[PDB]
Structure 1
Amino acid sequence: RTKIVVKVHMPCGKSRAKALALAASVNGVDSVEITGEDKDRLVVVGRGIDPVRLVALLREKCGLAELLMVELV
């Protein structure tokens, strides 16, 4: 049970929706959340998530994706 936090470039609601769906596609993701005062962080929660593959996918499709944190939960 890991929780992964990702800064993603998603300036409008259409990109927040694309990023949410894109993270969800990745093996082990149970939930994805939008957080931060600037609506620019994904909190990805699941089991067995490959966080390098997760950030690479969001980076490829959103331009910017920074892995801020991985944590057990």
Structure 2
Amino acid sequence: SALTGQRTKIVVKVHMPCGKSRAKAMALAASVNGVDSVEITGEDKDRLVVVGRGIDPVRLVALLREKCGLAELLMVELV
């Protein structure tokens, strides 16, 4: 893919209006190949920060979108 071998931070806005859906969305992101850590951020706790190496961002957003309805990729960045 486009980020093969690269350490990326990927920020996704996800519909997660309660603690149950936040736990579910983090676990979903964590299941994507290459993901090392997931963090919930934003004052409304509505963004996942996904960090890893070789992450396929297409697969990550597609999976979040299918299981939570709304998910949008805000940025991909190196670190």
Q: Into which bin does the TM-score normalised by the smaller protein fall?
A: over 0.9
Q: Deviations over 1:32-61 (max 9, x none)?
A: 000000000000000000001000000000
**Number of residues of Structure 1 aligned to a counterpart in Structure 2:** 73
Is it true that 1:57 corresponds to 2:63 in the alignment? yes
- Runs of at least 4 residues off by over 4 Å: none
For normalisation by structure 2, the TM-score amounts to: 0.92
Residue 10 of structure 1 aligns to a residue in which SS?
A: coil
Percent identity of the aligned residues? 99
Alignment equivalent of 1:34, drawn from 37, 40, 54: 40
Q: Distance in 1 between matches of 2:55 and 2:41?
A: 19
Can you give the 5+ residue segments of structure 1 that lack an aligned partner in the other structure? none
Larger Cα Rg: Structure 1 or Structure 2? 2
RMSD between superposed Cα atoms in Å: 0.3
Q: Distance in 2 between matches of 1:23 and 1:70?
A: 15
Residue 17 of structure 2 aligns to a residue in which SS?
A: coil
Can you give the 5+ residue segments of structure 2 that lack an aligned partner in the other structure? 1-6
Q: Deviations over 1:4-46 (max 9, x none)?
A: 0000000000000000000000000000000000000000000
For normalisation by structure 1, the TM-score amounts to: 0.99
